[PDB]
Structure 1
Amino acid sequence: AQNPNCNIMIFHPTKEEFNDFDKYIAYMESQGAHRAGLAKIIPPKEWKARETYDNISEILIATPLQQVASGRAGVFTQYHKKKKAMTVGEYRHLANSKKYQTPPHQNFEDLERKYWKNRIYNSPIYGADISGSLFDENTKQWNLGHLGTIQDLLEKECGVVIEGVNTPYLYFGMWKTTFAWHTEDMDLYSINYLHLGEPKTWYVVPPEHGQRLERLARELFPGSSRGCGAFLRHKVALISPTVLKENGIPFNRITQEAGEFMVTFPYGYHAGFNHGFNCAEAINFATPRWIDYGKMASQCSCGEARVTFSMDAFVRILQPERYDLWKRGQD
């Protein structure tokens, strides 16, 4: 078995190898990359996502989210308070202010320490889930707005034809902005490209050990657990590496820098934070191997996680028994 310790793998495709996206994903899996839950892909040196970022300040963040924490430094929840709209120019200036900027630090490790020690005491502002793309339409390789769609994968593998579309989303981050522990909707893959700015640190649990993280989460957030049988779908819970190590949960960590891709694999729990002002683009995708994960994916039926138009159809076709009760939570 390849990659039996479930380490995060890092790939350096040549420009020739960067032409066929599906084939490269299948290559990485042949090397065991999926066992980690997360892989890094460094694009060929000749490749670019676009020519410059010189005119991005006019993008609107219509609903910036202030991430307010509750709990203790290693075990907390966050709630997202909606703020008034601001442009990416305004947001970048805010990120660079004395109140919000990255503190002095020695290296990524000292910064990681400062994040876990100090995150709960602050409320950084995240511009998340903004529909759109920063890939130039002329970028032909690994353009996250030109991937094969999940609906088309389901049609090719299963013969069924369903409604729905699959488009990318932008994320504008600042120091301390946080993504809580989660898997993707319907335990899909995701791909995330860091277009610009400061790094993003990731934590991940191997898919084969995801249920260990779930059991710890039920112990650490016991009222949330009683409220919903899949409460990590709410994307509000944080657990530090120190707490994971104390509880024996297998995980790995890696820092993504500007110009790098990350891929998350089906049922790979992940969480992380941003080091400073940055912009990432991400989208879900599927392969044939995903289908069985989609059929088994948990769902939030308490109604908090409240998910997309396109996820309806996935549920309807892959989880017809759940269909019914799940759409009761989504209506």
Structure 2
Amino acid sequence: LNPSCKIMTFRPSMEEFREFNKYLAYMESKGAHRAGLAKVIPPKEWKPRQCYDDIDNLLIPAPIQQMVTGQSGLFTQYNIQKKAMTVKEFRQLANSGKYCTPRYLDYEDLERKYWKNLTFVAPIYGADINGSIYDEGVDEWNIARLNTVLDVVEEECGISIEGVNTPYLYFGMWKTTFAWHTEDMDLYSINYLHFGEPKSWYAIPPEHGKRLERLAQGFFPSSSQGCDAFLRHKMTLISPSVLKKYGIPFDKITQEAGEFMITFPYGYHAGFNHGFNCAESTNFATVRWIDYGKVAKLCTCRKDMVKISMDIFVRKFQPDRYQLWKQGKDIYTIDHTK
């Protein structure tokens, strides 16, 4: 049990690291999910790719220029699509004087500069790129093939996962942002920083996520009246100063190159990149997630958001509740600590 709901860091030996599914069960048995986010540092011997040199030639089809509007810790973001770029040209852009990381003392100093400089030069994010850059044959923690409940349902029952268990690449530069959100259907996610500058994360315990939602509804009431789950648009920024002021419990942590971050069901998170970097991530599920997916609040203003039917999961893994659930009588409130 993790009663403070603080973000945990794990350093498994190679023997402990080999099987991701087993280690994830271990992390939750230590209460790691109560923070909504955890870090895993793999042993120094492990390498998902021997050489990153040829990633320079990888094409970024639709780089995103992030426009931020607002003031004093409350901002809305929108995106402007830019012309296709290779990684090499993106890296040179990121390291130019207009876009490079500012000088800083420590991560805390840099965090301050992030929140002070959001509304000046708009950073460009090479985000949401289909693909993986693991070497072929890496069997440990292969983001492209984790073999979780999502995969079992797709391969054995022939049910469309809607591409949420496929890998995505993120080429960041300084000040590029991911806004406050939980994952689609309130799924888990895993994120590996292949190389480059760090990525800083903010996390809200699942047991306090509703308080973040109430706070955001009061500060963005127009966004709120337009969509019940508007935070899923990933356009809402709220600074740690605002969260402290209104008593929202949260934690922060910086992910360095070579480290995994895992987000848990209904764990709100947000953050920013320190500089040029490259990350890979996917969504996944465990049996524990099923009760979250059954009550996840979905986006009601856009046509084809990611909506996965829960029927197969309840029928196969919750046989004792299936008919009650389809009857509308499977009433419960989630215990985020178990």
TM-score w.r.t. length of structure 2: 0.89
**How far apart are residue 73 of structure 1 and its match?**
3.6
Output the CA distance in 1 between the equivalents of 2:327 and 2:4.
36
Mapping of residues 165-204 of structure 1, within 5 Å? 165=163, 166-204=165-203
1:31 to partner: Cα distance: 0.3
* 1:307 paired residue number: 305
Q: In structure 2, the residue corresponding to 1:13 is in which secondary structure? A: coil
**Structure 2 match to 1:93:** 92
2:159 corresponds to which residue? 162
**Contact 2:149–2:287 (Cα < 8 Å) also in 1:** no
After TM superposition, the runs of 4+ consecutive aligned structure 1 residues lying more than 6 A away are 315-322
Counterpart of 2:205, as a letter, is: P
Q: Secondary structure at the match of 1:291?
A: helix
User: In structure 2, do the counterparts of structure 1 residues 56 and 315 end up closer, same or farther at CA, with 3 Å as the change threshold?
Assistant: farther
Distance in 2 separating the partners of 1:235 and 1:293 = 19
Alpha-carbon offset, residue 45 of structure 1 = 1.6
Distance 1:123 1:320, change over 3 A: farther
Q: Please, what TM-score do these two structures have when normalized by structure 1?
A: 0.91
Q: Is the 8 A contact 1:181 1:232 kept in 2?
A: yes
CA deviation profile, 1:184-222 (whole Å, cap 9, x unmatched): 000000000000000000000000100000000001111
Check conservation: 1:41, 1:261, Cα contact below 8 A. yes
SS of the residue corresponding to residue 98 of structure 1 reads: coil
Q: Is the 8 A contact 2:74 2:238 kept in 1?
A: yes
> What is the CA deviation profile of residues 73-98 of structure 1, one whole-angstrom value per residue up to 9, with x for unaligned ones?
41001001111111111100100011
Inter-partner Cα distance in structure 2 for 1:13 and 1:116: 34
CA RMSD of aligned residues (A): 2.0
Q: Which runs of 5+ in 2 are unaligned?
A: 315-324, 329-338
CA distance in structure 1 between the aligned counterparts of 2:246 and 2:107, rounded to whole angstroms: 24
1:70 aligns with 69
Q: CA deviation at 1:321?
A: 10
**C-alpha distance in 2, partners of 1:55/1:289?**
39
Matches within 5 A, 1:1-331: 2-154=1-153, 161-164=158-161, 165=163, 166-303=165-302, 306-308=304-306, 311-314=307-310
Instruction: In structure 1, give the amino acid aligned to 2:184.
Output: D
Residues in 1 aligned to 2:254 and 2:59: alpha-carbon distance in whole angstroms: 27
Q: Distance in 1 between matches of 2:184 and 2:160?
A: 17
2:16 counterpart SS class: coil
Displacement of 1:307: 2.7
Question: Identity of paired residues, percent?
Answer: 65
Structure 1 residues without counterparts, runs of 5 or longer: 323-331
User: In structure 1, the residue corresponding to 2:55 is in which secondary structure?
Assistant: coil
**Cα drift, residue 153 of structure 1:** 4.4
Distance 1:215-1:87 versus aligned 2 partners, 3 A rule: same
Q: For residues 10-49 of structure 1, what are the alpha-carbon distances to aligned partners after superposition, in whole Å with 9 as ceiling and x for unaligned?
A: 0001111111111100100000000000000000121011
Kept in 2: contact 1:40–1:263 (CA 8 A): yes
| Equivalence for 1:329 | none
